[PDB]
């Protein structure tokens, strides 16, 4: 139902001295993580991180594991390589990241495909949205960019982002359908917190919802007032569901005038909430 994403976040962090680089691959579908590879692991393999993946057979794991190993090596080289291009000391730790995968719409039309890299916290080179041309962040990345045009890799990542990524996202949402296609409506309520003779804080809580997308508004007598409102970032509960709140400071004794409004995919219409002595 609606748009979906299959995303992989890969991180390689070099340790000159201290042993080989650390390399981590973690996979998500939408807001939900489903797989991991981690190089520091006693027995380093590609693993499930969502019970429904234990459905997929042993050659998948073995094949994913192996594919994850080539990249550990690729990232080993690409780090020494990058260390030279930037003319850095041999004894500094540094970070390569890579994100890739596909966003499709409800009709499985590829909305956008990704294959992008960062180095030490900044964009390094990215495959553009056309899936044919590359964007380099700086002249160092020009060196890399030229190899990849020359080797023609754009077409190898494109066919994947237009093909496998998408046909496999379809398959994973099939496997974990009773989690990934679910909706958990927010459990929501309004708390009152005195402060001074002049103010009190009202806080509007949305708990235990899925997917992560939510919008909490505060209104005064039926008019909007999002200006003058504290709100925390959406945060994970730890059980696969999310939490968010929005608070407003209001004058003592005017509490009943305010309405928090909660909007989620799970709710048949928005919730209006009002604090009640």
């Amino acid at each position: 139902m609606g748009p979906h994403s299959l995303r992989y976040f890969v991180t390689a962090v070099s340790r000159p001295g201290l042993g080989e680089p650390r390399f981590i691959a973690v996979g998500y579908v939408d807001d939900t993580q489903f797989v991991r590879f981690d190089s520091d692991a006693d027995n380093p393999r590609f693993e499930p991180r969502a019970p429904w993946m234990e459905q997929e057979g042993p050659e998948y794991w073995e094949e994913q594991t192996q594919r994850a190993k080539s990249d550990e090596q690729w990232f080993r080289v690409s780090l020494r390589t990058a260390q030279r291009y930037y003319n850095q000391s041999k004894g500094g730790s540094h970070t390569f990241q890579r994100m890739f995968g596909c966003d499709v719409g409800s009709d499985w039309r590829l909305l956008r495909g990704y294959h992008q890299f960062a180095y030490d916290g900044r964009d390094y080179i990215a495959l553009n949205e056309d899936l044919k041309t590359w964007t380099a962040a700086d002249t160092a990345a020009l060196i890399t960019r030229r190899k990849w045009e020359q080797a023609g890799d754009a077409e190898y990542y494109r066919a994947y982002l237009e093909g496998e990524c998408v046909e496999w996202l379809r398959r994973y949402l099939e496997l974990g359908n009773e989690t990934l296609l679910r909706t958990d409506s927010p459990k929501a309520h309004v708390t009152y917190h005195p402060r001074s003779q002049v103010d009190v804080t009202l806080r509007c809580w949305a708990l235990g919802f899925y997917p992560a997308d939510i919008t909490l508004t505060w209104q005064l007598n039926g008019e909007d007032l999002t200006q003058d409102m504290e709100l925390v970032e959406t945060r994970p509960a730890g059980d696969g569901t999310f939490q968010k709140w929005a608070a407003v400071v209001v004058p003592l004794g005017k509490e009943q005038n305010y309405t928090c409004h909660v909007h989620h995919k799970g709710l048949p219409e928005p919730l209006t909430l009002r604090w009640k002595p």
């Binding site: 996979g27 590609f46 690409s78 080797a151």
Partner: peptide, 9 residues
Amino acid sequence: LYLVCGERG
């Protein structure tokens, strides 16, 4: 499905 990197940096 994990797609490996082709040519190196």
